[PDB]
Amino acid sequence: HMLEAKFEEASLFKRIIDGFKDCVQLVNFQCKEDGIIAQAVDDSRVLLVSLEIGVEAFQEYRCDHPVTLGMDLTSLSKILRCGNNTDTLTLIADNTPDSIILLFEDTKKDRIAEYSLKLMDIDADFAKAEELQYDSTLSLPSSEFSKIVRDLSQLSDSINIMITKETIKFVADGDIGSGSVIIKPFVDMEHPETSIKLEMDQPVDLTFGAKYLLDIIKGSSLSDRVGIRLSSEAPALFQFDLKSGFLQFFLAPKF
Amino acid sequence: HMLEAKFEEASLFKRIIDGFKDCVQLVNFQCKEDGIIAQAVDDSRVLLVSLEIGVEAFQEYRCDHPVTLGMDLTSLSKILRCGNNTDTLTLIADNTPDSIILLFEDTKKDRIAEYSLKLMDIDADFAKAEELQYDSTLSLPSSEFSKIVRDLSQLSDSINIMITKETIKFVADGDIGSGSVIIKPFVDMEHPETSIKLEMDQPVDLTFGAKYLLDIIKGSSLSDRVGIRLSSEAPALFQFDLKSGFLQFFLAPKF
Amino acid sequence: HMLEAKFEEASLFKRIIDGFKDCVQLVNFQCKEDGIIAQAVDDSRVLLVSLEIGVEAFQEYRCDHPVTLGMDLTSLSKILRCGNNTDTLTLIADNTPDSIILLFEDTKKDRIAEYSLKLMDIDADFAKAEELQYDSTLSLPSSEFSKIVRDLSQLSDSINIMITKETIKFVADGDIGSGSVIIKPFVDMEHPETSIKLEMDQPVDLTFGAKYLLDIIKGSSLSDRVGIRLSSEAPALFQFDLKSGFLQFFLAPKF
Ligand SMILES: [Mg+2]
Ligand SMILES: [Mg+2]
Ligand SMILES: [Mg+2]
Numbered sequence: 001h002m003l004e005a006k007f008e009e010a011s012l013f014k015r016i017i018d019g020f021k022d023c024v025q026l027v028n029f030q031c032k033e034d035g036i037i038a039q040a041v042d043d044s045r046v047l048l049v050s051l052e053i054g055v056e057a058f059q060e061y062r063c064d065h066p067v068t069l070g071m072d073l074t075s076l077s078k079i080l081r082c083g084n085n086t087d088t089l090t091l092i093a094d095n096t097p098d099s100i101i102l103l104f105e106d107t108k109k110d111r112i113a114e115y116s117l118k119l120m121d122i123d124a125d126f127a128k129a130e131e132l133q134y135d136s137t138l139s140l141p142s143s144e145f146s147k148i149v150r151d152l153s154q155l156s157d158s159i160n161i162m163i164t165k166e167t168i169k170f171v172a173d174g175d176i177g178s179g180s181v182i183i184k185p186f187v188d189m190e191h192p193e194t195s196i197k198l199e200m201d202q203p204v205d206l207t208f209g210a211k212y213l214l215d216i217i218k219g220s221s222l223s224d225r226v227g228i229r230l231s232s233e234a235p236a237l238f239q240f241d242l243k244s245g246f247l248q249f250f251l252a253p254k255f
Numbered sequence: 256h257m258l259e260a261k262f263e264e265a266s267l268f269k270r271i272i273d274g275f276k277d278c279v280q281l282v283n284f285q286c287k288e289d290g291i292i293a294q295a296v297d298d299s300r301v302l303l304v305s306l307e308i309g310v311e312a313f314q315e316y317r318c319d320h321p322v323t324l325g326m327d328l329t330s331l332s333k334i335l336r337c338g339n340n341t342d343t344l345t346l347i348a349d350n351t352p353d354s355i356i357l358l359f360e361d362t363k364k365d366r367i368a369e370y371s372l373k374l375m376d377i378d379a380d381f382a383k384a385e386e387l388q389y390d391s392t393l394s395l396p397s398s399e400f401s402k403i404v405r406d407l408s409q410l411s412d413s414i415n416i417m418i419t420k421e422t423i424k425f426v427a428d429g430d431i432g433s434g435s436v437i438i439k440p441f442v443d444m445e446h447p448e449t450s451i452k453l454e455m456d457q458p459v460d461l462t463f464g465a466k467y468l469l470d471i472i473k474g475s476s477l478s479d480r481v482g483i484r485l486s487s488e489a490p491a492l493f494q495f496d497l498k499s500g501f502l503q504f505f506l507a508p509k510f
Numbered sequence: 511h512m513l514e515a516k517f518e519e520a521s522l523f524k525r526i527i528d529g530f531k532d533c534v535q536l537v538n539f540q541c542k543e544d545g546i547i548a549q550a551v552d553d554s555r556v557l558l559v560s561l562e563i564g565v566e567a568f569q570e571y572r573c574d575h576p577v578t579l580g581m582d583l584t585s586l587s588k589i590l591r592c593g594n595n596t597d598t599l600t601l602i603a604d605n606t607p608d609s610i611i612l613l614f615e616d617t618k619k620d621r622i623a624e625y626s627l628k629l630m631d632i633d634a635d636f637a638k639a640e641e642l643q644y645d646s647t648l649s650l651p652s653s654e655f656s657k658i659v660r661d662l663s664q665l666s667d668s669i670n671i672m673i674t675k676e677t678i679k680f681v682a683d684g685d686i687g688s689g690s691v692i693i694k695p696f697v698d699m700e701h702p703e704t705s706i707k708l709e710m711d712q713p714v715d716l717t718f719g720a721k722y723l724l725d726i727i728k729g730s731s732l733s734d735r736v737g738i739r740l741s742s743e744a745p746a747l748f749q750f751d752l753k754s755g756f757l758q759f760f761l762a763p764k765f
Contacts, residue, residue, distance in 0.1 A: 043496060157263040175343045234445055
């Protein structure tokens with residue numbers, strides 16, 4: 001076929017879609033020689049979600065020329081929980097397709113499950129949105145980021161992020177009280193993956209909608225770490241990196 | 256109580272009502288397990304305004320069974336400017352209520368302000384009016400839409416909208432002269448939120464009353480973007496999307 | 511100059527960078543009185559790469575005080591294939607440099623090639639990550655390790671390593687079938703360098719991403735042997751030893 005994109009772990013594609021599905025209905029997947037880009041805005045038209053999966057993330061990848069797969073994510077995710085986790089998953093399609101074929105292959109025995117999913121026609125033009133320089137760049141465990149966001153969103157729909165020298169501060173003020181989380185750059189010798197990194201070019205003081213942050217943290221499924229890039233000028237970028245790809249969320253400050 | 260619908264930002268409900276109040280006197284709010292729908296027609300009986308706020312727009316939401324709140328918007332908006340902006344706001348009511356309780360809670364200190372607003376009895380049957388397919392769908396910054404409408408309404412009470420391939424054209428002819436605004440689909444790399452999207456299934460050539468467009472643009476308060484859906488057959492739909500909801504305006508072409 | 515670090519074989523520094531360049535974009539080289547440490551994480555933020563080159567690896571070494579050289583590896587490797595292999599290579603820099611000078615000297619005739627490479631500003635804090643004790647330590651030919659990894663990665667993105675008494679077992683289960691490699695500690699009398707050594711303090715059963723293992727094996731360029739240290743508690747350590755240095759990869763198990 002024209003496109004044959006083989007994930008060795010179907011669970012990888014399931015975790016990708018879990019990064020999207022709770023805040024996006026429709027997603028266009030543009031498949032190219034160098035891999036797959038998907039983009040979608042959330043129902044409120046405030047959050048841009050951008051996925052890039054390069055050729056090397058796949059066991060085998062072939063796509064001579066572009067193919068656009070407009071998919072309903074509620075449909076795709078009834079079917080994406082059809083792997084075994086252990087299954088491989090190949091996305092298969094032809095030119096200007098009307099359906100996408102999801103081919104699950106068992107990695108224990110002799111079983112194939114071929115699904116054909118009806119595609120939808122979607123606009124669709126894409127934003128490659130990341131700036132050349134940001135005011136501050138940081139990274140931390142995505143489980144730590146998720147907890148901070150879940151915790152403070154209990155208090156307020158607005159979470160203020162402040163970056164100062166060697167200081168990252170999240171703050172929310174609610175009717176039952178207030179929360180302030182201060183994290184400092186820290187390299188963990190025993191478990192480096194839990195480190196916190198900060199590069200500050202200038203201080204940042206920006207407020208974000210917690211309801212959007214609660215969508216963003218579902219990228220946790222893809223990466224144990226999250227990179228955050230902040231700018232007084234441009235939307236904030238929240239990035240969950242895969243092996244040969246990433247899931248990006250762009251979000252303007254509230255003010 | 257039977258209904259307890261907690262906005263974490265009272266300003267959110269104020270901005271919702273600001274979308275309505277200048278063209279609608281009376282509004283029935285139907286509260287359900289999945290959130291709130293309000294509907295009203297303007298005094299001239301030409302513009303239908305439809306609001307839907309889902310459960311997730313609220314910090315906390317409970318409504319076992321339907322509750323209908325007929326409110327005078329001039330009254331509701333003397334009281335809706337009683338929050339601090341920083342206040343939370345819970346709408347509270349019981350079965351077949353005669354009043355609605357607006358409970359504002361301070362997010363800095365220990366203060367509660369409980370208002371009880373007398374309700375009015377209103378008909379009231381609701382139209383879920385959006386079609387399955389439209390001729391053309393587009394979205395743009397609501398501030399850009401507002402400016403175009405404010406600018407051209409200075410010239411004429413009729414604004415013609417024409418959709419052709421990759422072209423959106425607004426036109427007005429007045430006694431002091433004429434205006435033509437042409438916008439083209441454009442994805443902005445640095446500030447995606449300012450992008451213009453167009454999906455044309457067939458060309459459109461429709462004229463609308465500028466006085467109604469000037470009511471519609473007050474939805475600007477709720478969303479930085481506006482979706483517009485146009486049809487030779489059905490009313491035009493102008494849509495301002497919230498986090499877990501929307502404000503919709505339906506408007507027939509003038510001819 | 512402040513730093514003058516002379517490799518007698520430019521090919522040595524080329525082989526070092528080949529250990530990094532396919533999984534890391536940017537690398538900070540910290541130069542000190544006792545030699546050079548470089549550290550970088552891969553694009554997915556899962557693999558930590560740590561290089562240490564001591565003074566004795568160099569024909570001549572001088573560096574009174576720290577110097578940090580942030581280098582783009584794609585740039586450094588267009589230039590690092592500028593030696594003849596037979597050339598010596600001196601890295602030269604001054605205090606808080608903006609460029610690094612690579613001075614290649616011919617070991618046959620009278621020729622010097624001086625390159626000046628623009629440096630990049632990088633965070634950069636470093637993890638000295640190795641634990642005091644691991645559950646199991648082993649070493650084997652790096653070409654044997656590479657083959658096992660290349661072979662099993664054809665089958666699966668997950669390679670399970672199990673250590674039991676006098677037994678090292680690598681296993682992968684794929685859609686076309688499964689592979690199990692069992693190696694046993696063995697001292698080779700004729701070619702000791704090909705021996706396999708195992709020290710087991712407790713049994714190990716850990717699964718690793720094959721895509722990361724495929725990055726790690728490129729350390730083959732530096733050493734004919736690889737040491738592996740495994741722990742139920744800490745990341746796995748894969749180590750390629752030079753004369754007076756090493757290249758280390760730290761990698762958490764998949765589960
Ligand atoms: Mg598997
Ligand atoms: Mg607040
Ligand atoms: Mg030589």
